[PDB]
Design a protein around this ligand. Structure first.
Ligand SMILES: O=C1NC(=O)C(=O)C(=O)N1
Length: 512
């Protein structure tokens, strides 16, 4: 059992994931009390795409080492992803308690899913950042160059058909064309996926494939290019590499557009946000010194021709009736967010709720939940996984997009609005809970940022039972869509590049 588990750990290392699971299973069966085993069976199954089973292992892992914070955090994040709300209140309290005593175990990105103040979030991101910052030894300090073309770098694991590259690409294209004085460098931590996004990016910047490399080497590689300002678009989220940034390969390091919160990190100099999503009230809760673009913090791909979707029926929708949708990551679909969406459904009879098909049995769960809330399960409709262009097309059948709290739709909110679908949100009290709000505000749709849950249901019921007002809202989105600066990458470029040159001067750049 102790041996098995390690062979199967070997299999794990050499992507023979299928057998890793069958070995680790064989171990777990024979020694069902061994927490370390339960724990490896769990990462095993997960990476063999057996979600439900994977989470079952973390449950037992938790039953065996109840006082263990890291396991508890891992279990909660797994249950959110599967929309399994058994004991969510307790689990959520333990994770927050850990952060408070931290130790250390809560991953900051998972933590974004919790009902937690901007303060707890800072505590959490600082605690993590510290354990990393200590175990590492920074590279020889350097300074922003005095003379010349400013070298600006961005590191990300989604350059290509992913959120990051998918938001930044028209931006990178505008900057090549409008900000010649800036030299744009993309350090891509994932390989060429053959997406036209990946080509475009490579065509608009100098794209370095550092996918082969390790933390130390990556830093050293960035430093080889003598990058003056280095943007972390990663951020505490999956596909590393914070330890890269801890080596401070660049003398100025900016947290932007990727991780919707503070880094808590001593190696991170600036965060870039906006007046709305990061307002003065919230600055004390950022370790970075705050910068702000003139408009919304988020760019997007303003060349996308939204395609034509298949008929409502071929998309599983009925023909008449309002389609309110919430395309978002499953972990964001919390009890509070589902309740308020289902409340709309109850009071507006005709009507339907369109969701992304989640992992494991998430969809069965949300069905059963809808029924518990006294709503026909048939009225939830689930979209499968689809290439961006076909996915993006689906918003054409959407009537109103209903945001989640406390972790807003981010790229999906930008996607809706671009296709012309209004987005309803309740801007909360942390950056991540204010991303929709900031798009709406900057687009001019303040009436779509409402105060609380009751207001959310009220506004949505208003729109859903008055198609006249609803059709007119779309019309309004459309005007605002082409006239606000939110979707003017050209202006966004000019803004960014100027704010970039400014930062550079403060750290002693003499331009030219
Ligand atoms: O481009 C996307 N394709 C998807 O299938 C999806 O779920 C999403 O959020 N974004």
């Amino acid at each position: 059992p102790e041996a098995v588990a390690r062979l199967g750990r070997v299999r794990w290392t050499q992507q023979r994931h299928a057998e890793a699971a069958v070995l680790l299973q064989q171990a777990s069966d024979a020694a069902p009390e061994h927490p370390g085993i339960a724990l490896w069976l769990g990462h095993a199954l997960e990476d063999a795409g057996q979600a439900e089973a994977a989470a079952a292992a973390y449950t037992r892992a938790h039953q065996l080492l109840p006082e263990e914070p890291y396991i508890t955090a891992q279990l909660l994040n797994w249950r959110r992803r599967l929309c399994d709300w058994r004991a969510l209140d307790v689990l959520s309290a333990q994770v927050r308690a850990a952060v408070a005593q931290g130790v250390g175990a809560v991953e900051p990105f998972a933590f974004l899913s919790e009902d937690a103040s901007a303060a707890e979030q800072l505590a959490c991101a600082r605690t993590r950042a510290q354990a990393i910052a200590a175990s590492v030894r920074p590279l020889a300090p350097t300074r922003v160059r005095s003379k010349g073309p400013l070298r600006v770098g961005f590191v990300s694991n989604g350059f290509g058909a992913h959120p990051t590259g998918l938001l930044t690409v028209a931006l990178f294209e505008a900057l090549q064309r409008r900000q010649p004085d800036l030299q744009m460098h993309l350090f891509a931590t994932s390989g060429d996926d053959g997406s036209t996004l990946r080509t475009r990016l490579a065509q608009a910047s100098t794209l370095h494939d550092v996918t082969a490399l390790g933390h130390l080497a990556t830093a050293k590689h960035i430093r080889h290019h003598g990058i003056d300002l280095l943007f972390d678009l990663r951020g505490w989220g999956g596909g590393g590499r914070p330890e890269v940034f801890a080596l401070r390969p660049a003398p100025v390091q900016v947290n932007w557009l990727a991780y919707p919160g503070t880094s808590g990190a001593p190696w991170m100099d600036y965060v870039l946000g906006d007046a709305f999503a990061l307002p003065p009230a919230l600055e004390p809760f950022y370790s970075e010194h705050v910068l702000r673009l003139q408009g919304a913090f988020q760019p997007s791909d303003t060349s996308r021709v939204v395609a034509e979707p298949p008929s409502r029926t071929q998309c599983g929708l009925p023909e008449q009736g309002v389609v309110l949708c919430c395309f978002n990551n499953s972990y964001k679909l919390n009890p509070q967010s589902m309740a308020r969406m289902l409340a709309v459904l109850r009071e507006v009879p005709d009507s339907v709720l369109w969701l992304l098909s989640g992992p494991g049995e998430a969809d069965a769960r949300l069905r059963a939940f809808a029924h518990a809330q006294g709503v026909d399960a048939q009225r939830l409709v689930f979209m499968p996984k689809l290439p961006h262009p076909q996915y993006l097309a689906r918003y054409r059948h959407a009537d109103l997009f209903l945001d989640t709290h406390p972790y807003n739709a981010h790229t999906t909110a930008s996607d809706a609005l671009w296709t012309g679908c209004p987005v309803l949100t309740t801007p909360g009290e942390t950056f991540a809970a204010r991303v929709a709000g900031s798009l709406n505000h900057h687009l001019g749709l303040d009436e779509m940022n409402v105060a609380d849950d009751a207001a959310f249901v009220a506004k949505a019921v208003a729109l859903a039972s008055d198609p006249a007002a609803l059709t007119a809202l779309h019309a309004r989105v459309d005007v605002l869509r082409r006239a606000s600066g939110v979707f003017h990458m050209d202006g966004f470029a000019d803004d960014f590049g100027a704010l970039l040159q400014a930062l550079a001067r403060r750290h002693g750049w003499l331009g030219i």
